[PDB]
Amino acid sequence: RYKPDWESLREHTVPKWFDKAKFGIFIHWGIYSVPGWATPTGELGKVPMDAWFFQNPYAEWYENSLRIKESPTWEYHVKTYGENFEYEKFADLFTAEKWDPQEWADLFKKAGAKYVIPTTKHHDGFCLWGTKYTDFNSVKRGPKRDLVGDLAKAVREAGLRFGVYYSGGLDWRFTTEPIRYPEDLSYIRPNTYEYADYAYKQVMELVDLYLPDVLWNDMGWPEKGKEDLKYLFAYYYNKHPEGSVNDRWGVPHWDFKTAEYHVNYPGDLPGYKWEFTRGIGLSFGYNRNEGPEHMLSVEQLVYTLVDVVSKGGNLLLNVGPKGDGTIPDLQKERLLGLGEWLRKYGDAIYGTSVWERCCAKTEDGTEIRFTRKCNRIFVIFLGIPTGEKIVIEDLNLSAGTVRHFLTGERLSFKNVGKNLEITVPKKLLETDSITLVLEAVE
Amino acid sequence: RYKPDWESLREHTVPKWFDKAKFGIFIHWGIYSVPGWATPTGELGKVPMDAWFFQNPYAEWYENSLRIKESPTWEYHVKTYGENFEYEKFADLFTAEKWDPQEWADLFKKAGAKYVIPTTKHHDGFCLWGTKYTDFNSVKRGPKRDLVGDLAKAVREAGLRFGVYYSGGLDWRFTTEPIRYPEDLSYIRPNTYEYADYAYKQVMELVDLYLPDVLWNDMGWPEKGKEDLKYLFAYYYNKHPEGSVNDRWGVPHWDFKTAEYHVNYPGDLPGYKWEFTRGIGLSFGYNRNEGPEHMLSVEQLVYTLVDVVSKGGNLLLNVGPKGDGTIPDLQKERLLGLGEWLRKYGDAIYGTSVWERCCAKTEDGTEIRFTRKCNRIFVIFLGIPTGEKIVIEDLNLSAGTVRHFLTGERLSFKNVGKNLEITVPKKLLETDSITLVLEAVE
Amino acid sequence: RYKPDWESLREHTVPKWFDKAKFGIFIHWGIYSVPGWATPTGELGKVPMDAWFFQNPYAEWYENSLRIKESPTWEYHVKTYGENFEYEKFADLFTAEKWDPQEWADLFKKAGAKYVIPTTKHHDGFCLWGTKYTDFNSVKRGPKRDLVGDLAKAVREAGLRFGVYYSGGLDWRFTTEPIRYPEDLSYIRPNTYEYADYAYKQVMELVDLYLPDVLWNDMGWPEKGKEDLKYLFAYYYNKHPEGSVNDRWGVPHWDFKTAEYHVNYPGDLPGYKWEFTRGIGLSFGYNRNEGPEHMLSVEQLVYTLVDVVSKGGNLLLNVGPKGDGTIPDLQKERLLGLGEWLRKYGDAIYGTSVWERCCAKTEDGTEIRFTRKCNRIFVIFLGIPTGEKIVIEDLNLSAGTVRHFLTGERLSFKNVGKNLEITVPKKLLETDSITLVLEAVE
Amino acid sequence: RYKPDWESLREHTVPKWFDKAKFGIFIHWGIYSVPGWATPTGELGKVPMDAWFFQNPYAEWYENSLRIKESPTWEYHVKTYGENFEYEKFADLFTAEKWDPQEWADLFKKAGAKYVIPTTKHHDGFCLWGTKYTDFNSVKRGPKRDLVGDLAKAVREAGLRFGVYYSGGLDWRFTTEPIRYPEDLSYIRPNTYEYADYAYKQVMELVDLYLPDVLWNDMGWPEKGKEDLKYLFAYYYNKHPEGSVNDRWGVPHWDFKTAEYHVNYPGDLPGYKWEFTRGIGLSFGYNRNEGPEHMLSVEQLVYTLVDVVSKGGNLLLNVGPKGDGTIPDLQKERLLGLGEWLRKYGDAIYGTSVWERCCAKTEDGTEIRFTRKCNRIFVIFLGIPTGEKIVIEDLNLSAGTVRHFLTGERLSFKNVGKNLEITVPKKLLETDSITLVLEAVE
Numbered sequence A, B, C, D: 001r002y003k004p005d006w007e008s009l010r011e012h013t014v015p016k017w018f019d020k021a022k023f024g025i026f027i028h029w030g031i032y033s034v035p036g037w038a039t040p041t042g043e044l045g046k047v048p049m050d051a052w053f054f055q056n057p058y059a060e061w062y063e064n065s066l067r068i069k070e071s072p073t074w075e076y077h078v079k080t081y082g083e084n085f086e087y088e089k090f091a092d093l094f095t096a097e098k099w100d101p102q103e104w105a106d107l108f109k110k111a112g113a114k115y116v117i118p119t120t121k122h123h124d125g126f127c128l129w130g131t132k133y134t135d136f137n138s139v140k141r142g143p144k145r146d147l148v149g150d151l152a153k154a155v156r157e158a159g160l161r162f163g164v165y166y167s168g169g170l171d172w173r174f175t176t177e178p179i180r181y182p183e184d185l186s187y188i189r190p191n192t193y194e195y196a197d198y199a200y201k202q203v204m205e206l207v208d209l210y211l212p213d214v215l216w217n218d219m220g221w222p223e224k225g226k227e228d229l230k231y232l233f234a235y236y237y238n239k240h241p242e243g244s245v246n247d248r249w250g251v252p253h254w255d256f257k258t259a260e261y262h263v264n265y266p267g268d269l270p271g272y273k274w275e276f277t278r279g280i281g282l283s284f285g286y287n288r289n290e291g292p293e294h295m296l297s298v299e300q301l302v303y304t305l306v307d308v309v310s311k312g313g314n315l316l317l318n319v320g321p322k323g324d325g326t327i328p329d330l331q332k333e334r335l336l337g338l339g340e341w342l343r344k345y346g347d348a349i350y351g352t353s354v355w356e357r358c359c360a361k362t363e364d365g366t367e368i369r370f371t372r373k374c375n376r377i378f379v380i381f382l383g384i385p386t387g388e389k390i391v392i393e394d395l396n397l398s399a400g401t402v403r404h405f406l407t408g409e410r411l412s413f414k415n416v417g418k419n420l421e422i423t424v425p426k427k428l429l430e431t432d433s434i435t436l437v438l439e440a441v442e
């Protein structure tokens, strides 16, 4: 038994399955999916924060944007729906008419994901399960259905892990003024004891109804309720020792840390487990305004995954479904490309560990990443080099044998001074898909 | 006026009437009284705590037991009521069809009790008064009646003090998981600010409606509400200076401490006022599974009372009535035996004080207890010795006169070394009921 | 054992010996006894606090008054000792050349006192024992003798209980500014962590070196050190269960409360143990400026002790010795006359308890006080009535036998309406000393 | 950098080197080594705590036992050294005249230890380095040498990791009363702000002077100083990321947990890093009263290390040197036999990981332990089976090749039901030392 106290909770570390899975699908789906609109400004971390909330690229932030009169969202909303059309009205238009949880789960498995995490309640406070603490939920309005539970049954039947996302730090059903600048976040929150109970009661409810594999909180936890987390974490781990929690609660305990777009992204091995998340585009919620120019290409997806895993992280790729429950083609296609790549190269990803260094580069500038499986070291090039002569800067090996990963063909190499030289027969080079991958054995 | 602060509340000590009363009746009555069932495993303090909650002898813990699938209670419940029969359904079958508060009060007075304390809300959260904070109460469900108030009017008319018991530390209407081990108690509680208000509002309600003589809390008080107790105690004492509170709140203040079965039972004079409680059997709530083999015999009751009073305590004997409001015969009979004994010997009990030592024994092993009334010392044998020659080990007296209590007959004695010898004419010995009692005067 | 927490410390209550002792001697002696000077302005509680610190009648406040320039003390010091004579210089004049502790203990025993409490350190911070935590003490300076130790031995030898007074709240060795108004006390204090450790250590030292029967703190305890008291009190009681503690610490626990001159004086029975304290004159420290007109007369002292005792308290009468270790004649005379009355009527004071009411008055206004001893009720007249017929207003008796206390002579009485009438033969009235004492027996 | 807050410090986890090291030497050496005496009553966890401090088998508790008069230690001290010989006087006898640190480091390296942790200050408060915060240290008294420093250099020279033990929780230089029951520990502690600064400063000093690989605190950290730990740990890790900290601080952070004799010993895999600690006999300090009957045999030591290691821990074996700086022969002999077994089987211990289960047993009860190295699984018998046919209960294998570890000889096996059967030729069995070791490869 874990006791409700931080020294005791410390005993729980990130479970094996989370560390070994290296890819998960995040799903931001909610009534905001109906208007599905946002100005695709840029990535978090590179857009100046004095403009960010005013031209918010995160479509799930639609209601906050709508509350800022004279903001692209406002003008858009009025022109499209009218002024006499409140944001909550979207809960009624959120009908998930074409939703099929099993087709969703099939897709995530084909994409190579090993876990899934849907938003059970986002900042707008709309709940996707039949909670007994609010009527603003999917059983009573719109879909007339328990979205979280139905998706959980499907995910689990497809053999994948199931976690839940909850916006504990923000709930627009409890505030009126929108966030215009980062500083507003320090005082524009529910703030009441009522809200702290509520968040607690709702996460306890999700633990009792679905016993999620991951508790993914966002935006910190209500100051008044932080001490509650000792009990909730103890309660959770005693029912599910293989469960886990992220680092956005703002308390002493967490099993893995998180980075979002440019924010808190590590340039090298961090020394603790973490997970990277971002959308396929610039939004988490569906944005009908995004074109492929705003999205990662399958190749960049592969590169992102590789960089992440070589640094000890997991990638939590987000998909943003439509109000009718379908996944936009641009996203579905990218997911499949990635799934294809993972089918060929997955053995140098899943179940791997970090090596001594995560990164390297060739004399010509192609970047490289490493992953380990005992005595096996995988060398992953972010691209496929043209010349059969490959020079890796600042690297030597006491291996003795280096194979071309996909064919298994023994290759010739030698440490030439501070570098390492390997010859890769263009026949092999041409067999690789987005990344040249070699396996070295020490 | 007492101010709402511990240094000030300290000014209030256990009132005279509580110290002088030495016997009270506890009443655990609730919807759990309907199924009235528990495996009579043994006494608290002697049953291993890794099995205790799984074969709980406390029938009022029926709902907790029911929540542990595959527990005797579960198997029993399913076989008798069925799976589709929730615990709350018992509030509707709790009809107190044959209840007569005055007959209850008559009985407690005949038994020699000077105060009474019914459970107003037990761990299952069902309330026995028409509280305005919950519908799960006896006015709205089952008895369709204010049980607490009606019993209070009857007790008070019979001339006895009236207190109330409240389960502040536990409320199963606010949790889902049952207690399986002692450690669970540290995190499986309401935990919310809502619950802390609720407990406060409900005890304030009982103070305003019935101004009880004793506030008997159980299982500690919600951490979030501890500071509230400064105000509630001040409020209470300023309306009733002769009121009192027990020690199960977990705050700096209390008027008297408590011991339950083997738990915290003193082996000698403690040095502060306390009260002992236990059932006539092994349960507090009615257990149709208990036979006389599980209950104290009138003689053991008398002994328990005597040991307790000689150590400065009060005995709070519990009776567990049936769903129809009647008191099982096995319990009624024991109560009357005790009442009979108190009629003869009461003057060496009520209004007494502890002496220099509480205990002694005869050369043959019969145990003895002392009580005082100024210059009068009562000597109470836990049994009636056969020989007319009685030898008390490790005791001397500078009295000069020793009388046989019931007849008042001057007896012959002398301090023989480290012992004391008294001759008790078998005519007298044979006049005593369960205890030989002598009175010495210094 | 007692634990270091308020809930557990609550268990300790005022010891029997303190309760039964009814009189103790307070001794304020220190380097302030050398100048031994103050403006005897009036009693505490009757002098407006806007003038108090400027015309302070407490001679032990000399250093504080000295720091307020243009203060009678200031003018007096400069003409007597000079501007360049620092207060601290008095430790070198404090020689106690004529001190004889056994003579003191003897006088206190003859005076009827059952315990003694000397100032071990007063507000000026000079310590009367060889503490290891400051050189400003009596073993290193002045007397070069452990006054506390020598006195503790002598009091004990005389068979008297010994306690210690400590100034936890003020220590002028840690401040520079004087106290000019009550408000100043809110911020002119040591304030440091260092001082809170210092006071804890010094009291621990007194407990270790002398295991006092009473820990009598004054002026509150440093806020930073308040939590330490749980630890200090548990330590103390664990070494000396029959030890006791007063109420001037500013924390939840205490064994008895205190009243000083008019400050906090009960008009009636309080409901808890307390003690009244005052000088024989208007100061605690020796004041050469006080004459008989500033002191209580033997008669007023007896009256005082009776009033207090009848209200459930102990009288802690103060003596203020000279710098040489002698006790001024005026003080001695009053102690001896009080001891003489206590030799006659001790039995109606020592070991008594409060009755139903503390007070009454005769038809022509002679005040009456009551005390108890089981069934014996003492009736103390604050003075001796001249007529033989005596009418006590608002008092009835259900005794049957009223005696004259000194002779035992049975007297004639009858309840006449809401009063009680009694005949006391002048030959008896003529035998009493300052109080007519009757003894009723119900 | 790590920040001074628990959320950030969580990032630091037990370093790789500690995890891989599997054995370390603890050294309890101090002025208590001079009397070097204790009643070897039994193992911690098996001696009732009502007698423990009165018959303490931990010789380094000598000062505490000495303060309990009429204690075997007390009687022994008075007949040997005399009533007037204060404990502190041992610092003058503590001369370490025959000490040779390189000889110690050498013995620890031969014994198979990969790290060393000496007592820098034990409960008696005497410091084995020239601290600037107390004169009661080894540079000023006794040896007049920096023992910690000299030992740190020697251990490092021998290629071993060096950590420090510090008694944060107890320091008998700040108390006067002994510990007689566990409960006493709740209040007999330094308690001051001064001591909390002292302990922080002393540990900061150890970090500054020696940058230890392990900070091993004992007995909790002063409550007043707990917040300081955030600052101290951030400081430490920022200077030495590969440094580590144990779990005896009473705060949220720690890198590895600890078990002592029976206290906190896991019956199975724990799920976190931990370390078992014990003396070779029943004491940590040298005890002249212990003979071979109180010590572990080489065989039991090997068994111990294997059990621990298979459960994921490190064994921290204690040595207790004499006052002269020599290590008793009995101790030395056991260290050398253990080093001899480690020279043979080191490869199945060092740098291993836990397997699926830690344990198993043969059909006739020989206990079995498992450890791992990638695909290689070590099978360690706690003893050498006499027959050649060996039956492991409840174990199946999916390897295909099991070898004899010392020879490499491939052996014959088959899964027979819920068991595994194997033939080990006696010529092989005859080559093993205390343990039969098999190596399976799946």
Ligand SMILES: CC(=O)NC[C@H]1N[C@@H](C)[C@@H](O)[C@@H](O)[C@@H]1O
Residues within 6 Å of the ligand: A028, A058, A060, A061, A218, A219, A260, A263, A277, A284
């Ligand atoms: C860095 C941060 O606090 N982000 C909050 C952000 N998290 C994303 C995964 C989305 O759910 C956004 O809606 C949310 O504001």
Ligand SMILES: CC(=O)NC[C@H]1N[C@@H](C)[C@@H](O)[C@@H](O)[C@@H]1O
Residues within 6 Å of the ligand: B028, B058, B060, B061, B218, B219, B260, B263, B277, B284
């Ligand atoms: C020792 C303790 O905390 N007991 C709680 C216990 N008190 C009894 C008098 C009954 O009311 C039980 O139902 C309750 O759990």
Ligand SMILES: CC(=O)NC[C@H]1N[C@@H](C)[C@@H](O)[C@@H](O)[C@@H]1O
Residues within 6 Å of the ligand: C028, C058, C060, C061, C218, C219, C260, C263, C277, C284
């Ligand atoms: C009411 C109060 O706080 N009095 C403090 C007062 N106590 C007396 C016994 C003397 O020691 C004075 O010097 C002290 O200031």
Ligand SMILES: CC(=O)NC[C@H]1N[C@@H](C)[C@@H](O)[C@@H](O)[C@@H]1O
Residues within 6 Å of the ligand: D028, D058, D060, D061, D218, D219, D260, D263, D277, D284
């Ligand atoms: C379980 C515990 O708190 N043990 C304290 C104990 N630790 C040992 C390694 C020795 O240093 C003992 O002296 C110390 O009291």
